[PDB]
Amino acid sequence: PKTVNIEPGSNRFLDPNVEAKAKDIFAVPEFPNKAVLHNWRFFIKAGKAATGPPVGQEFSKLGLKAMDFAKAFNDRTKPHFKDDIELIVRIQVYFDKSYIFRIEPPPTAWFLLRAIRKKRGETGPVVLRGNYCAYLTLEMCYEIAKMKQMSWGKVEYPPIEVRVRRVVGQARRMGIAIIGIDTVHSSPVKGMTEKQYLEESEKHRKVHMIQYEALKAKELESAPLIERLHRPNMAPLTNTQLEEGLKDANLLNALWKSSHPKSLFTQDTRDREMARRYLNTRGWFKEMTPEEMRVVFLNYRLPKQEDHQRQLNMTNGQAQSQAYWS
Amino acid sequence: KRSGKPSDLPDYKQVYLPYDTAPTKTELDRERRKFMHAYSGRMEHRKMVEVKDVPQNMYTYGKEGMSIPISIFKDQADPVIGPEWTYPGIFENKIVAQHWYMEELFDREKSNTFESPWQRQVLDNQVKRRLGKVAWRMSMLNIKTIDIFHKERGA
Amino acid sequence: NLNKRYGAPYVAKGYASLDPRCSLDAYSSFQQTVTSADMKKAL
Amino acid sequence: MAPELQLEYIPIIFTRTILGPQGGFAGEERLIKREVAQKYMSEGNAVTPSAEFHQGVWCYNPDSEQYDRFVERNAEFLDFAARKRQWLDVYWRVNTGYLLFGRQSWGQGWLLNCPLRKKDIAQKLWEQYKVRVDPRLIEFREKDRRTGIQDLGHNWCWLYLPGAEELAIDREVYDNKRVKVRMHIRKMSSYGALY
Amino acid sequence: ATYDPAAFVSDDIKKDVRRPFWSRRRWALSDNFMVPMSPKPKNTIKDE
Amino acid sequence: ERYYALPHLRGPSMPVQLAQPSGKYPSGKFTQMMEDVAIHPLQKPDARYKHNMYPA
Amino acid sequence: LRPSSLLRAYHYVHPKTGRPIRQYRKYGDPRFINNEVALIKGLFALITTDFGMVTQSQLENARLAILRRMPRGSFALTMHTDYEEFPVVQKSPESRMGAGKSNIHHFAYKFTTGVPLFEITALSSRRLNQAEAEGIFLAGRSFIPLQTAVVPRGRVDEYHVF
Amino acid sequence: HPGLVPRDKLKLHCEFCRFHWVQDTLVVRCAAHPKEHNQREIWLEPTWTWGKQQ
Numbered sequence A: 001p002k003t004v005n006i007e008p009g010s011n012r013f014l015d016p017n018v019e020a021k022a023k024d025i026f027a028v029p030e031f032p033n034k035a036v037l038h039n040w041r042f043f044i045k046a047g048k049a050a051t052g053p054p055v056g057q058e059f060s061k062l063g064l065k066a067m068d069f070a071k072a073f074n075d076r077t078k079p080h081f082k083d084d085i086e087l088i089v090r091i092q093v094y095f096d097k098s099y100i101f102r103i104e105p106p107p108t109a110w111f112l113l114r115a116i117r118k119k120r121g122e123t124g125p126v127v128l129r130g131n132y133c134a135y136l137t138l139e140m141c142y143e144i145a146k147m148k149q150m151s152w153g154k155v156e157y158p159p160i161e162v163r164v165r166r167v168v169g170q171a172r173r174m175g176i177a178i179i180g181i182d183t184v185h186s187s188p189v190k191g192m193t194e195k196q197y198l199e200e201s202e203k204h205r206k207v208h209m210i211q212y213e214a215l216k217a218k219e220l221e222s223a224p225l226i227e228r229l230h231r232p233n234m235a236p237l238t239n240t241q242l243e244e245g246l247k248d249a250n251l252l253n254a255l256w257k258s259s260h261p262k263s264l265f266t267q268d269t270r271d272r273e274m275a276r277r278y279l280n281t282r283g284w285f286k287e288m289t290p291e292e293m294r295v296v297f298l299n300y301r302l303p304k305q306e307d308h309q310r311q312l313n314m315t316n317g318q319a320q321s322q323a324y325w326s
Numbered sequence B: 001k002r003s004g005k006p007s008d009l010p011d012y013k014q015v016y017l018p019y020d021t022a023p024t025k026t027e028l029d030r031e032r033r034k035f036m037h038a039y040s041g042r043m044e045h046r047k048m049v050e051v052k053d054v055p056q057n058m059y060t061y062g063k064e065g066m067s068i069p070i071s072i073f074k075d076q077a078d079p080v081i082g083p084e085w086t087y088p089g090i091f092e093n094k095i096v097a098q099h100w101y102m103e104e105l106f107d108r109e110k111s112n113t114f115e116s117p118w119q120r121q122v123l124d125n126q127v128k129r130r131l132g133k134v135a136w137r138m139s140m141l142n143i144k145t146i147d148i149f150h151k152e153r154g155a
Numbered sequence C: 001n002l003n004k005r006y007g008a009p010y011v012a013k014g015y016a017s018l019d020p021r022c023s024l025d026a027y028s029s030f031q032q033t034v035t036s037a038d039m040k041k042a043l
Numbered sequence D: 001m002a003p004e005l006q007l008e009y010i011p012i013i014f015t016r017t018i019l020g021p022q023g024g025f026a027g028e029e030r031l032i033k034r035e036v037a038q039k040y041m042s043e044g045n046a047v048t049p050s051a052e053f054h055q056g057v058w059c060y061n062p063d064s065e066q067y068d069r070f071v072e073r074n075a076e077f078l079d080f081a082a083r084k085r086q087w088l089d090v091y092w093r094v095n096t097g098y099l100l101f102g103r104q105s106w107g108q109g110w111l112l113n114c115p116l117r118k119k120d121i122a123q124k125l126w127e128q129y130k131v132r133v134d135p136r137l138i139e140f141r142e143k144d145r146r147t148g149i150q151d152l153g154h155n156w157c158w159l160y161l162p163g164a165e166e167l168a169i170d171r172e173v174y175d176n177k178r179v180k181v182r183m184h185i186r187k188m189s190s191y192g193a194l195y
Numbered sequence E: 001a002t003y004d005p006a007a008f009v010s011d012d013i014k015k016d017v018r019r020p021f022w023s024r025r026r027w028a029l030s031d032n033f034m035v036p037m038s039p040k041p042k043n044t045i046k047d048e
Numbered sequence F: 001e002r003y004y005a006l007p008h009l010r011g012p013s014m015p016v017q018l019a020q021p022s023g024k025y026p027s028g029k030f031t032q033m034m035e036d037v038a039i040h041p042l043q044k045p046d047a048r049y050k051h052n053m054y055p056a
Numbered sequence G: 001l002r003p004s005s006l007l008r009a010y011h012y013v014h015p016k017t018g019r020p021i022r023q024y025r026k027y028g029d030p031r032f033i034n035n036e037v038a039l040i041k042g043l044f045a046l047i048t049t050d051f052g053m054v055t056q057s058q059l060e061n062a063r064l065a066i067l068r069r070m071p072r073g074s075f076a077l078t079m080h081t082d083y084e085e086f087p088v089v090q091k092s093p094e095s096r097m098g099a100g101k102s103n104i105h106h107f108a109y110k111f112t113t114g115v116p117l118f119e120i121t122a123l124s125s126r127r128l129n130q131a132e133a134e135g136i137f138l139a140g141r142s143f144i145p146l147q148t149a150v151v152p153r154g155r156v157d158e159y160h161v162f
Numbered sequence H: 001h002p003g004l005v006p007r008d009k010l011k012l013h014c015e016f017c018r019f020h021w022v023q024d025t026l027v028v029r030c031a032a033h034p035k036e037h038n039q040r041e042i043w044l045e046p047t048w049t050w051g052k053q054q
């Protein structure tokens, strides 16, 4: 009937409404560069924080009337919240006894038991319990994963498609057999043939790549300048070169210079060939002209978009163009 | 543990259907009949096992337009589920996310035949763990002598 | 405590100094040829 | 044929691939002991050489675990089942054998006073078992790489049977490239002892 | 078609290395669990 | 008299695709750097808490 | 005579009389070095690198100790028993008070080199390490009166265990 | 202090359990659990002679 939005994967983060007050409370009062004494962690309900043994005790071990914090907690957690949402509080006590606490979304194990409607004790790993518990489908984990962000300052990264494999694994480790995997057949649809279902995935599953890469590359271009530096791959080196290349570092130097994507500073024939004359005495790579090295001695962690942008000779023409200006 | 568990378990409130053609009763228990089993363990040690608490209709179960009760905020109801290709990497995760025995992964690398371009990433994150289970295995032995299986086991 | 008094060419010695390799090279010369000129030089 | 006089060993074409000394492998003709062979022709690992089997025989692969693999014995295979037999005959001969010694040993450390040479193992291989090898292959243990064997009782040392890769010979012998020849040094007085 | 005894046949007089007590971790890995050689009594090998 | 003796070599002496697995648990010298391992002092690995936290 | 009409190879029984065969002392002498290696099929097995005479009570006390140090649901110990048994104090003046009945009853095995004794065999995809393995056997090895070393799955590569 | 019959049986049970050369005998000395976890290698007494302990 009504599909809310037809786009190849634009439902990545929450609604800007709920994502507005998502980080209003899930924020990190910045580390004062003090020396932490205790990093406590609690489960606390929406606003039902008491001065009892769960909270008030560990303060009272240190003489802090935690009758105050609970209020300062409820100064931030009593509204905004569906009833009975057990949050995690990361209380952090410094050597001046001044605490600083981040409220955090409920543990994903709490999410998982909700989204499947199972109580404590009903769920279990099959090797302890013998049965897959409540089903799920990947379509659901993608929304448990949207309220679970590592950096609640940067809700974007790590990406969603990369932190759903996290919540999926935590699920399987609890017995939550999701349907898209773990089973012979995916979720059956009244729409079309399995082929007319698989032929509509082979396009979607790859359209996501140019979506996922670009988001993996756009994040790369913002990464620290050292993260874009060159780190040659070590899959080619065989484990006797890989060991004879650890006793004398000279080989792991001449290698780096030998297989280094072309830049304005590495277009020195003698420099790049000085290495190439060191390896041959060591009987290392000898039948691989510079090109087929760069395509194998590249930082594999590069997104495929930029995996090419540095690839000789794509970076040979404009190579001598880009320089330290002045 | 008792704490950190949900007490109130809201129920699946189907928002809008994902189809115009009703899935007639006859075929419902004809496809659900296939789901009451789900594999487990991924090697020669493949174990087709049973799944308890099977939902009844999976044309409607999660493929679109149902709600999930992870209701958290005040103004955010049980969020609706957009269609499949509206979530990123889902039919790509279907290739990646699963129990991977390294026995089954290293024959894929030494033959460079990955079904997915991320199984090279689920491999490292899997070996980078097992090395950690050692660099912690040993940064403990620099304290004392910890000997495996040397204390009683069982009852 | 041999190999201290005697050399390494002791105990680690395959005293079979007769034919570990020559027999092979014998079948090598077998392969190539001998002919008129190979006798004419002998002539 | 008589119940009294029975062939002490009989001809046999192996269908399976048995590990043991009396064993063979796919398709070779071997005269193995009668009692053993008779529980092969019932077992199916072997079949008496009828004129038909002398060309091909349906040997066995552990892959599908049934007699499917046709191994045709042309003159080329008969140059393969010879080098592969002649090889694992040296194996099963030194591995089965237990080559003895008689040596002099005065003093207390139960130490053979003139310890053994790799010459003096190939010498007791060719003497007793007629196994003619290169004494350059016999690797001693770590305890006896320095001083030779040197001690009474049971010593063993490794004999390296090199040329076993084009014979496709593994899992039918205990170790493709070695074999444990098993010494024993039975000390004796000047009456019966040498050196 | 040459086999050189020297490649694979290695007769090296190797120094039996002490279990290094001077470092803690390498003392624990080296703990070859056959130190229960204490059952080496030259017991009756053909009777009981 | 029968004399048993090795056949002549037609292929590689030490078996390669026929090698029996080593037979001792292959915990390599690099997964537990027990001994026999030599590393350049510039390239010292894995001090993520001691002296790799401030790498050079 | 001597061995025939065996009682399934545990001990030989006289052909013309159901009495046990009462062999010689140095019959089945373990003082060989066993040529045939063992193709263990458990994950790890405890082979005897030396030779000796080991009782059944010494082998059962070892099992009761191995069965303590082992994870229960995962690995199931496997103890081999097909080997042949042998008598004890049998002879008549060589027994105490003419009680040849109560001395021979003990049955001990004559183990050569490299016989497998136990097996930490697997019942799941759970795995073991040599450190995780020797730790188990280190309890029982202190009862089995002869020298023994644990070996991993498959054919014991006796180049290394020795 | 239980003489750990061979030297090789020595194991450092506690964090404070270290090795020491107590007169040519490698031993384990711990400040904590002072004699509870102490181990001493088997060797001749510190002051032996050639006729008394060979």
Ligand SMILES: [Zn+2]
Pocket: H012, H013, H014, H015, H016, H017, H030, H032, H033, H037
């Ligand atoms: Zn202690």
